[PDB]
Structure formats: structure tokens, C-alpha cells
Design a protein around this nucleic acid. Structure first.
Lengths: 571, 362, 170, 107
RNA sequence: AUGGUAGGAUAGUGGCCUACCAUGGUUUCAACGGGUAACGGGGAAUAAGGGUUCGAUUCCGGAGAGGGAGCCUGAGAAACGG
């Protein structure tokens, strides 16, 4: 921190990743006191929630090696007292920058944090990668993170943060609450699988692997996984670290919740099984954990379906909810998850007990449909686009901790067809069009177009017998737009109309372009349509659309006029 | 201007073609006298794009991915040519010794350029003019450069692949070829897998740091009228898929998962397969374009169906594509340049901010 | 920028590059104007004031003779198969002097029927050219230098000219 | 190396008296030309100029190395460092590509 | 580097360049190598009708137009008239 104070590096990026027993209140207070002595104005405190920044402020000026931390009876908690940091007319930085000058800020703000000079951010790995990039910009920011702990992420998220960078970084491993090398804590970490070694494994690290054609999507018994064999311990710890590295959050009781779930099973994708040895433990390629749903045996898919519509048939159907499905953390380019999704679809479509359970030696239940509930990530939408899981239910209120909305997807992975999934997708297509900029103002336009393509593919999917939409009648077109607006559109065809005059008629035009009446006439489905959807459905400005489409000239205005003149020819 | 599709409702637009003439062909010699002699509303409607003409245009065209520049090698005399999309004309013209049958550029904006001709001289050409000329032990048919490990390498019809490891100023590492087929060379941009176009449809793969080959492949046509040379190879940017294209017009899209077959398509004429270009950088992924001598065909690599096709009036032997665009270049054997824009393939770039507007509605 | 100058060389002893002049207009070593097959293209080059050299860049037909009766018509080109002084010149299919190139000499057959009236076994000529009127791919050389003539001329190979050249073909 | 005895152009234990012998063989060809007047002398140039040749391996030169038709293992002094090398330009960590090189996705 | 043949290029012979061959060529009669304000040589040139052998006449050793690089027209030219 003193070296960063002495250096003239404008991008003073300080990264601090620590394990258990870090003393983060003492560490941030020491950094705040160093920034008090050799800083310009103050330090902007950034945390995802009301964390121990007050304990960090209590450890900055006061707060010696005997911390004496308290919940609500501490000196920092009480406001009606004199904490001896009372400032006056002097050049003192400890008295001025104090508990009266706590520069706390939420990490969701980016413009005010970009205007700041010195800031400190804690648990930045919990924030999104674009959010972390907007937070840790070209200013002097010190980043604090906790690795392999409760309510935290893994080393792969830290490695993804390191891949987002490349700076000035350091690591801490020794505990401060207890001492490092405690065997009871080592036994507790062994019992709770707190140690993460998926990156430390020599065969399940990245996309360098065998072919996904020779994929062994075998099964494993839950009691065999619960057995404390030495081979079973190494595979389950590799399986748990694979689940830890993929998901951002990591509940400490999630492993016990997965083990005790009788209605949830798991399948392990493996590489090509070498018959030359056959007995050595192979690292699995991917792990897929799913659960059933219905009225047999945890019903988030049925609760969302009941909230979406009144479908007692879909409520009582045999649905499958994928709890977790992931390959190795750097094996995203391997594509083995696509074969695993193909294997999971094929599985729906056809001392102790034995350890290695065969894929063929398992009778599956008569499942009606499958699916999962994932966040609105572009890569997650890309994995669902490679899959058949069409999204239907989207959470309007996004998760505060995750920072992203929740999307529930379903796929009819059975010979039996119901056509209620196709009917609900058309309702979901109409709902997602209406929810554009009603609550979903801040969303990616390309991802919204990809979601619209996901709804269109479900419309073009199976059980397509009598769900074909019709065009617009002459009376239907008369109710849609007035004759004066039609004459206004002819002036737009004469290109004398501005973006303001065209933008007034853009609202009913956007619903028509989402409707099948305009689609039957023409198809302007290039990147101009995404600009058309962002202007109308997402209600963005012309400058906002131009920055999103990376074509900031008047060609965005020209593309909208070309789309408008195509609609004028559609009359 | 033009509305010529392949009867698939994909509105391909072609600019500066041989159908349209030079709207400013001779301002003093012709246009001053023919202003009154020809009102020429069609010629006033002819819109010249990026304002040069290139006669017997090239056997090699190139566009730098940064700086927005283009590279061209003329053959009326051996030429080297710089064009600037920010300034829309001839940035620079210089003669050279022989006709550049192959060429590669440094990674940024025309600063350094490596040329290969009919003779065995490699031309390192900097910001100045003709900085150095070298010698190659065999002749020249193909060359390519890796910024990783600092090594160009050159090969033409023999046994030793000449790795021009430009660090320390020598060339080393004679890689042992098989049966004198190296007619194309290719780069895996992320990992450095080598590729050689063998006359008996083999391709090599080498580890550059280990200086050793790892495997060989074989490409077997089910019809197999004649034994064939694979004529070009290419690696996608994701580091997964591999492309092959032979003299019999058979394009192979090899997904690397130890597969004898591929996505196999044949051209309608089967003269050759010249170059294979991906379109991963633009949206609507899994679209790929292969070019014959007289047809360039963009098609879906997974559906196996033809997206569109561009038919020129004269034969071509190079295809260049600026990334982020729906825009393409050719090196035709004629006085104009066939360059064509497909708005459904991608949007127009920044210098063509009005070329997207003028032909969409006309 | 190529040099044809005589002082660039070493001496009979091997004198060490005396460096008298630099390049002038008079020793202008021109570019190698290698051609190819295709639609005909002509460059006019002005040298020595009034000498107009004709650079043939692309060429599609030629005036090739048949010496046993002394006649030559216009024949459409097909492709080169052998050159004595080079091998990659053949793969480039660039027609220089003395290059052995295929043609489809249909009007040679049409003249033959219009002068004799007898089919070709489907006063006489030797049997080794009857192997490929059925194929229709007749071999011919190049007589004139095309780089300065702007013309393609040759003759059909005759008797021992095959028997030495398919020996060099295989 | 054992100390019982590097510019090889002066070597004392090597006894090549070729310098006067080449003069003597020049004195040979001067006297043999003057003595081949009637019919034939002993040896005008046979095994004399050849004896100069085979000891220097006739010329110890290669035609391909002359034209640049053979590869040259020497430093070309302008082309040291314009295209100067880069950082770790492998976007993977290169040990999974060793698995890709050992277990090929075509083999 | 020396030749052979072929090709390209040249206004043109040409290893000038390239291809593929054969290995050779210049020398004690000195090949290669160290000295020269070679403002010194050249009948280059009348003479000096006696200034000893010259007082005087001229050719003379090159590159360049701020610097590398390429192009351009003219029976003239890699122009300081682009």
C-alpha cells in the first residue's frame, strides 16, 4: 500500500485474495490508515452489503491487536458517544477521515465510483465480471476477496478475475483467528470438502481431453458416493470441486442437501474408458445433477408453472429439474456438455454394492419433460441454444446477490407430446415482449433477440398442428394504425420524416413486427431488427441503441427507415 | 445499382463490378468533352466506391484487421499497393521485382510486410521501401507467420520446411516433409498446429516448441474420381474445428473429435478449393464460405445447406473479408475489383456507413 | 528494379565489386512478365523511344503448325504438361517458350476431313498421334517468346519429338 | 587437450610443405610444357592439379549453398529484431495441449 | 566461380538472372594484396623566332539536389524542367 502510494501508477490495482482467518477488518483498517497518510481526499468504501467496514473503520485509528469486536454494543455501533476521532480545524487525516466521514458506497454504482479517486472494494468476486470491470476501472482501487470459504466463490472465479486482468496482487493462507496447520480444522475441511483441488487435478482441468464421441455418461449410487472409500473420496471431492468452481455462490450445506435429497440423482460423464488398465480411478468429464418433479416423492419448476398459468396437467406431470450440470472449469470449449445434454436426452429416450454403475443398467421413470432454471447469462443462453431447453418463465425481479434475473427453461424430452409447452411458450413470447422495458429496461439487446429466437424456435418446434398464427385483416390493420398514421408512414417512405416522427409510430410497429402478420409479409431479421426491437420494445434512445450496436453513425437511423419503408411496402 | 441474388431472398449487392464503369474514367480526356455529348443519368447514378482501379488485379489480396487498410499485388507490372479505408483511395503504390504469389503482413497496420514470388526471394518490407531481399532453398508457393515464438515458415514442393525464426536473425528447423506436398500452409491461431497441403491428401501437424510432428491425416472422397491434392487448410478461431479443401472441389469441415468423416460438400464445377473463411466474428454463427475459381459459396457448416452464393463475371483466386462486416474482397483477373456486400450476412463497417443506406432502398 | 548490368558480376579472377555506377535508364532490367491462360490481355511497353514491346499477360489461343504437310490453324488452349527448364512453371500454367501444352485441335481434324475425307480409325501419319485424336488432347510446343511478341506460336510435335518427350513425361 | 603438444592455419606438428610443392608443381607444369615438345612427357597435369584438389576436397563447396538453394545457418544481420517476440501467446496453459498432442482429436 | 543447354529479360550477345548439369577457371611470364593533394597524369594543344624541358590551351576521379524507396514522359534522361 505504501509502494502503491509512492508509485505514480494511475491504474493502481491492488488485489488481495485470502483464505480462512484473514483479519479483513484489521487489513482494511491498515490500508485505510495508509491511504489516510498518503492519499488525496478519502477512501470510497465499496461492499456488496453492510459488511465489516465499520469494524475496518474501528481498526483503522483505534482497534489494536486486541480487537474486542461486538455485534451492536461496540463503539462504532453506538452513535451517541465521542469516539475520540472528532475532527477540528487542522490537517489531521485520522480525525477528519473517520467514522463521521465514512465514504461508503454500493458497488452497483459505476459513474460515481468512476468519479472517485481512491476506493476500496471487498468481495469483488461475488460481483459480475462486467460489474467488476466497471468497478475496478482506471482509478486506484484495492480489491479484497476470500477464497474457499462460506458464502464465497472458488479459485476458478479468482482465476476468471485474474483472466479479466493481466497487476499488483498478493495471497494469504495462514489463519489469524486460529493458527494455520490445525488438524481439527484440517479434519473439518476434509469432512465438509472445503479443500478445492479441481485446478490441481492433472486430468480434469481444461478443454484438453479425449473426444466427446467416446463419452462414458455412466451413473453412480448415492450410497456408493456416501461410502468413505478412498477411491470414492477422491472422485466425490473432484465432483464437489467441479460443482464449486462452476457456480458463483457455494452454500456449505449444499453438499449435505444434495446427499440427503432422495428425489435427486446424479450422472457422471467420463472420458473414453481405457480397457488397457480399467481399474485406476478416472477423472470424470462432467457431472450432471438433476431432480424429479410431480406428485410422487423441491417443486420450484411446478410453483413457477402454477404461478405462470393454471396447468394442473403440467403440475402433475413428471418434470425434471437439473440442479447442476457442468464440465471442468476451463473445459467450456470442449463441448462435452452438449454431448452430456444429448446423453441426458438419450437417457430419457432409452462390504457394499457396486461402485461404477452402468448407464444401461438403470431403469428411468416415465418423465414428461425436462429442464432447468438458470441465470440470464449469454453463455448460459448459448448452452440452452445448443440444447432444447426453451426458456418460458423469467423472473422479473432480479436476484440482489447474483445481480441477474432467473430464467426457467423447459424441454419436452419424451415421446409423449402435450402441446401445452408450445402454448405456454407463445404466452411467454407475448409476456417477454410486454416485459421489454416495462421492467426489463436494462438488458442486453442481442440476448433479448436470442430469447426471442428461443421463443420462435419453440414456435417452430414439435406439436405444430393447429397453433399457427394468422396475418392481419384490413379491419385488424385499421384498428392497429390510423389512416393519417399510414399517410405519415408514406412520408417516412419519402424519408422526410425525422426519427421523432417515426418513433411515435414505432410502438405499434414493434408489436406488429413481433407478431406473425408482419413476419408472413417480409423478414427483416438481420441486425437492423435488433435495433428495431431495442428502439421499440426496449424503448432505448437512438444514441443508446447506437452505442449498443457499435455503429454510432446515422446508419442506425438509416436501418430503421429501411425497416419502416419495408413495412410501407407491406401494406 | 444492383439487386442480384442467388434466388434465395438473400439480397446480395455488388459494388465496383465489371458491369458498372469508371464514373470518373478520364476527366480531361473524356468527361470534359462528353459532358455535353452524354448527359448520362445512369453514369451519374454510378457511385464509385473507394476510388481506385486495379488492372489484372491480384493473385493475393489482404486486409489488416487493425488500422482498416487493404493490401494488393498488381500484375501488369509487379506492384505492391496500400489502400486506406479512412481515406478511401490509393494510400501508396510501389513496384516490386516479381509477381507476389503469396504474401503475409505483420499483425498491425501495414508497418512490415512479407512477400513471396515466383523466384525464391522473401521480401521483408518496412515503412520505407524494400528493406531486405532473401533467398529460399526451394521455390515459393506458401508462407505464413506466427507472432507466437517469432517464426515465419516457408515451403514449396520438397522435403524441408524452412522455419524463418526471425529472432537472432537466422532461419532454422528444417521440418521433414513427406512426398513433396506443401502446396498450402495454415495456422492454428491459438495453439500453433501446423498444416501442409500434400498431393496425396495428407496434412501434417507439428509442435513448434518441441520441433516434432505428431500425426498425419487422410481425406478420402467416397466417389474418388482421381487422387487429389488438398489445396487449402484453415483453423477456426475457437481452436476446435478444422477445414480442408481439395482440387476436386470437395470442402471438408473436420470437427476435431477423432473422426474419419466430416461435413462434406462438393462444388458444382470442382476446379479447386482456393480459400476457406469462417464467420465466427459476426453473428449467426456456423456460416462458412469456400471459394472456387469461378464461384464463392457461403453455407452453413452444421445444417449443410447453402446460405448464398456470389457469381463473378470473371475468374477470381482470392477472397478477403473485413471482420465485423458483411463485406468481401476479391482478386479477379480483370481490370475492376469485385467487392460485394450482404446486409443479411452482417452490417456495413464505419467507412461504409452510407453504403448500407443507399442500396437497401435505392 | 532488376539489374541486367554487366559490372555487377565478379571478374574472371573474381575482382571484388569495384562499384563504379548505380543504375541508369539504359540497363533497365525489366520485370519477368509471366503469363497464364485465360481471356486475352495486352500491355504496350515503350522502350528506346519507338520500339513497342507487346507484353502478353493472358492468352487463350495460338497459331501452331503441323510440319508434315505445313499448315497451321487457330486452336483453343487447354493446359501445359511439361517444360524442360522448369517444373513449377507447369503447375503455375504459365506459357513461356518451348513449353509443351495441350490443345483440342478440332479444326485440325476438320481440315483433315476436308482434305482427305476419312475418319481416324474410330498420305498417312504415324500411329502414336492416333492415341489422342480420340482423346482430343493434342500436344504442342511454344515457338515464339510470348513476353515481347504479344502472341502465342508453336508447332505440333512430330515423330521423335513425342518419343523423346513422353520419355521425359514419365 | 592433454598438453602433449585454435587457429589451424599455422600448425607446427602438421607438415604440409605444399607451398613450395605447389611452386614445384608450378615448376612442374612450366618444365613439362617445355619438355612435351616432341611427343609426350611424363605428367604435365595428370595427378598434379588433382593432387592439389583432393586434399582440399576438390573445392569443399556446394552449388546449392552458393545459390541459396541450400539453407544457411548464419545470422542475417538486418533481420534481427523488427518482428521481436511476444509474451506467452498461447491462450491455453499449454499442458492440456500436450494432452491434445499426446491424445490427438484426429487420432 | 567457370562452362553446357533451356527459359525469362534486354534494342541486343550474353551466367545479366533463373532452372538443371559437368566440376572447374587465373597464376613464379606474379594471379590476389599493402603507396600515390592520381590541384597528378593526358602530344590534350599550339607553341615559347632562346623566359634551360612549356610561361600558357584543355581533358580531367565521382555523387547529388534535405534524406532513403518507387514511378513518370522524351531519337534525348532512372530529370534537380515531374
Amino acid at each position: 500500500f505504501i509502494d502503491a502510494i509512492s508509485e505514480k501508477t494511475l491504474n493502481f490495482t491492488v488485489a488481495l485474495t485470502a483464505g480462512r482467518g484473514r483479519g479483513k477488518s484489521a487489513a482494511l483498517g491498515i490500508s485505510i490508515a495508509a491511504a489516510v497518510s498518503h492519499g488525496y481526499s478519502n477512501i470510497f468504501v465499496t461492499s456488496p452489503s453492510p459488511e465489516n467496514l465499520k469494524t475496518l473503520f474501528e481498526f483503522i485509528f483505534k482497534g489494536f491487536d486486541a480487537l474486542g469486536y461486538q455485534e451492536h454494543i461496540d463503539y462504532d455501533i453506538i452513535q451517541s458517544t465521542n469516539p475520540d476521532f472528532n475532527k477540528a480545524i487542522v490537517r489531521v487525516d485520522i480525525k477528519r477521515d473517520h467514522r463521521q466521514t465514512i465514504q461508503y458506497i454500493v458497488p452497483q454504482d459505476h459513474q460515481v465510483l468512476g468519479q472517485a479517486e481512491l476506493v476500496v472494494i471487498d468481495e469483488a468476486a461475488a460481483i459480475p465480471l462486467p460489474i467488476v470491470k466497471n468497478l475496478l476501472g482506471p482509478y486506484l482501487v484495492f480489491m479484497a476477496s476470500t477464497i474457499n470459504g462460506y458464502e464465497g466463490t472458488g479459485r476458478s472465479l479468482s482465476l476468471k478475475l485474474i483472466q479479466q486482468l493481466r497487476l499488483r496482487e498478493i495471497s494469504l493462507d495462514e489463519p489469524i483467528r486460529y493458527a494455520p496447520g490445525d488438524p481439527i480444522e484440517k479434519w473439518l475441511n476434509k469432512l465438509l470438502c472445503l479443500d478445492v483441488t479441481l485446478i490441481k487435478n492433472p486430468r480434469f482441468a481444461t478443454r484438453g481431453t479425449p473426444h466427446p464421441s467416446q463419452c462414458n455418461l455412466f451413473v453412480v449410487n448415492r450410497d456408493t458416493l456416501f461410502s468413505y472409500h478412498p477411491v470414492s473420496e477422491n472422485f466425490l471431492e473432484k465432483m464437489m470441486a467441479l460443482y464449486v468452481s462452476s457456480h458463483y455462490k457455494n452454500s456449505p450445506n449444499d453438499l449435505q442437501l444434495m446427499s440427503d435429497a432422495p428425489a435427486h440423482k446424479l450422472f457422471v460423464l467420463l472420458p473414453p474408458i481405457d480397457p488397457k488398465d480399467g481399474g485406476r480411478i478416472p477423472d470424470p468429464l462432467c457431472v450432471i445433477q438433476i431432480a424429479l418433479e410431480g406428485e410422487i416423492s423441491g417443486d420450484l419448476i411446478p410453483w413457477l408453472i402454477s404461478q405462470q398459468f393454471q396447468d394442473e396437467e403440467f403440475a402433475s406431470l413428471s418434470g425434471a429439474r437439473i440442479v447442476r450440470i457442468a464440465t471442468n472449469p476451463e473445459y467450456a470449449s470442449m463441448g462435452y456438455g452438449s454431448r452430456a445434454i444429448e446423453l441426458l436426452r438419450d437417457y430419457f429416450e432409452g462390504t457394499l454394492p457396486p461402485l461404477l454403475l452402468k448407464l444401461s443398467e438403470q431403469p428411468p421413470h416415465y418423465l414428461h419433460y425436462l429442464g432447468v432454471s438458470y441465470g440470464l447469462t449469454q453463455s448460459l443462453h448459448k448452452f440452452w441454444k445448443n440444447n432444447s431447453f426453451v426458456p418460458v418463465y423469467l423472473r422479473q425481479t432480479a436476484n440482489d446477490l447474483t445481480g441477474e434475473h432467473t430464467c426457467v427453461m423447459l424441454n419436452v424430452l419424451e415421446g409423449r407430446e402435450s402441446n401445452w409447452l408450445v402454448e405456454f411458450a407463445k404466452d411467454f413470447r407475448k409476456r417477454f415482449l410486454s416485459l421489454l422495458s416495462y421492467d426489463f429496461h436494462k438488458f442486453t439487446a442481442v440476448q433479448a433477440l436470442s430469447v426471442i429466437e428461443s421463443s420462435k424456435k419453440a414456435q417452430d418446434l414439435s406439436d405444430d398442428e393447429k397453433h399457427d398464427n394468422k396475418e392481419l385483416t384490413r379491419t385488424h390493420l385499421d384498428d392497429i394504425f390510423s389512416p393519417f398514421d399510414l399517410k405519415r408512414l408514406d412520408s417516412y417512405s419519402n424519408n422526410l420524416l425525422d426519427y421523432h416522427v417515426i418513433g411515435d409510430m414505432i410502438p405499434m410497429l414493434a408489436l406488429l413486427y413481433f407478431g406473425d402478420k408482419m413476419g408472413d409479409s417480409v423478414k427483416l431479421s438481420s441486425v437492423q431488427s435488433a435495433i428495431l426491437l431495442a428502439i421499440g420494445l426496449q424503448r432505448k434512445n437512438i444514441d443508446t441503441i447506437a452505442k449498443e450496436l457499435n455503429l454510432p453513425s446515422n446508419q442506425t437511423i438509416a436501418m430503421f427507415a429501411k425497416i419502416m419503408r419495408k413495412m410501407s411496402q407491406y401494406f | 445499382v444492383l439487386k442480384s441474388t442467388s434466388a434465395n431472398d438473400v439480397s446480395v449487392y455488388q459494388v465496383s463490378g465489371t458491369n458498372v464503369s469508371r464514373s470518373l474514367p478520364d476527366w480531361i480526356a473524356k468527361k470534359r468533352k462528353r459532358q455535353l455529348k452524354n448527359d448520362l443519368e445512369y453514369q451519374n447514378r454510378v457511385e464509385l466506391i473507394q476510388d481506385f482501379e486495379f488492372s489484372e488485379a491480384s493473385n493475393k489480396i489482404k486486409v489488416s484487421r487493425d488500422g482498416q487498410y487493404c493490401m494488393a499485388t498488381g500484375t501488369y507490372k509487379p506492384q505492391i499497393h496500400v489502400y486506406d479505408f479512412a481515406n478511401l483511395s490509393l494510400k501508396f503504390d510501389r513496384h516490386t521485382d516479381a509477381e507476389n504469389v503469396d504474401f503475409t503482413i505483420l499483425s498491425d497496420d501495414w508497418t512490415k510486410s512479407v512477400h513471396l514470388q515466383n523466384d525464391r526471394s522473401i521480401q521483408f518490407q518496412n515503412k520505407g521501401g524494400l528493406h531486405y531481399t532473401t533467398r529460399i532453398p526451394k521455390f515459393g508457393r506458401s508462407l505464413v507467420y506466427n507472432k507466437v515464438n517469432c517464426d515465419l515458415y516457408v515451403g514449396a514442393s520438397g522435403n524441408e520446411l524452412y522455419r524463418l525464426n526471425l529472432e537472432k536473425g537466422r532461419f532454422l528447423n528444417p521440418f521433414k516433409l513427406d512426398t513433396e506436398g506443401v502446396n498450402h500452409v495454415s495456422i492454428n491461431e491459438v495453439n500453433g498446429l501446423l498444416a501442409a497441403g500434400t498431393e496425396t491428401n495428407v496434412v501434417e501437424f507439428w509442435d513448434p516448441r518441441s520441433r516434432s510432428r505428431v500425426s498425419k491425416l487422410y481425406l478420402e472422397n467416397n466417389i474418388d474420381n482421381r487422387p487429389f491434392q488438398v489445396t487449402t487448410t484453415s483453423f477456426r478461431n475457437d481452436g476446435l474445428t478444422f477445414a480442408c479443401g481439395t482440387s476436386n472441389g470437395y470442402s471438408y469441415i473436420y470437427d476435431l473429435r477423432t473422426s474419419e468423416p466430416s461435413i462434406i460438400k462438393d462444388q458444382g464445377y470442382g476446379f479447386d478449393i482456393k480459400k476457406i473463411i469462417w464467420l465466427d466474428n459476426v453473428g449467426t454463427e456456423n456460416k462458412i464460405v469456400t471459394c472456387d475459381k469461378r464461384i464463392a459459396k457461403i453455407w452453413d457448416r452444421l445444417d449443410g445447406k447453402a446460405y448464398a452464393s456470389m457469381e463473378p463475371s470473371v475468374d477470381i483466386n482470392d477472397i478477403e473479408h473485413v471482420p465485423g462486416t458483411g463485406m468481401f474482397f476479391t482478386a479477379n483477373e480483370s481490370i475492376p475489383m469485385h467487392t460485394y456486400y450482404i446486409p443479411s450476412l452482417g452490417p456495413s463497417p464505419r467507412w461504409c456507413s452510407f453504403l448500407d443506406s443507399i442500396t437497401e432502398e435505392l | 528494379g532488376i539489374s541486367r548490368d554487366s559490372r555487377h558480376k565478379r571478374s574472371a579472377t573474381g575482382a571484388k565489386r569495384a562499384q563504379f555506377r548505380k543504375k541508369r535508364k539504359f540497363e533497365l532490367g525489366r520485370q519477368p512478365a509471366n503469363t497464364k491462360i485465360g481471356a486475352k490481355r495486352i500491355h504496350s511497353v515503350r522502350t528506346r523511344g519507338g520500339n513497342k514491346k507487346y507484353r502478353a499477360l493472358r492468352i487463350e489461343t495460338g497459331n501452331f503448325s503441323w510440319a508434315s504437310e505445313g499448315i497451321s490453324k487457330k486452336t483453343r488452349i487447354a493446359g501445359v504438361v511439361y517444360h524442360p527448364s522448369n517444373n513449377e512453371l507447369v503447375r503455375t500454367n504459365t506459357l513461356t517458350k518451348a513449353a509443351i501444352v495441350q490443345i483440342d485441335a478440332t479444326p485440325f481434324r476438320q481440315w483433315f476431313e476436308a482434305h482427305y475425307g476419312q475418319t481416324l480409325g474410330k498420305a498417312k501419319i504415324e500411329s502414336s498421334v492416333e492415341s489422342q485424336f480420340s482423346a482430343g488432347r493434342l500436344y504442342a510446343c511454344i515457338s515464339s517468346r510470348p513476353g515481347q511478341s504479344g502472341r502465342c506460336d508453336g508447332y505440333i510435335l512430330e515423330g521423335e519429338e513425342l518419343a523423346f518427350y513422353l520419355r521425359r513425361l514419365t | 587437450a592433454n598438453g602433449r603438444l585454435i587457429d589451424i592455419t599455422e600448425n607446427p606438428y602438421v607438415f604440409d610443405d605444399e607451398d613450395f610443392y605447389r611452386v614445384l608443381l608450378n615448376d612442374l607444369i612450366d618444365k613439362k610444357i617445355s619438355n612435351a615438345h616432341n611427343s609426350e612427357s611424363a605428367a604435365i597435369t595428370i595427378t598434379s592439379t588433382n593432387a592439389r584438389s583432393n586434399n582440399k576436397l576438390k573445392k569443399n563447396i556446394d552449388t546449392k549453398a552458393s545459390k541459396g538453394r541450400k539453407l544457411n545457418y548464419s545470422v542475417q544481420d538486418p533481420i534481427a529484431n523488427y518482428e521481436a517476440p511476444i509474451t506467452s501467446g498461447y491462450k491455453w496453459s499449454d499442458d492440456q495441449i500436450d494432452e491434445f498432442f499426446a491424445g490427438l482429436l484426429g487420432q
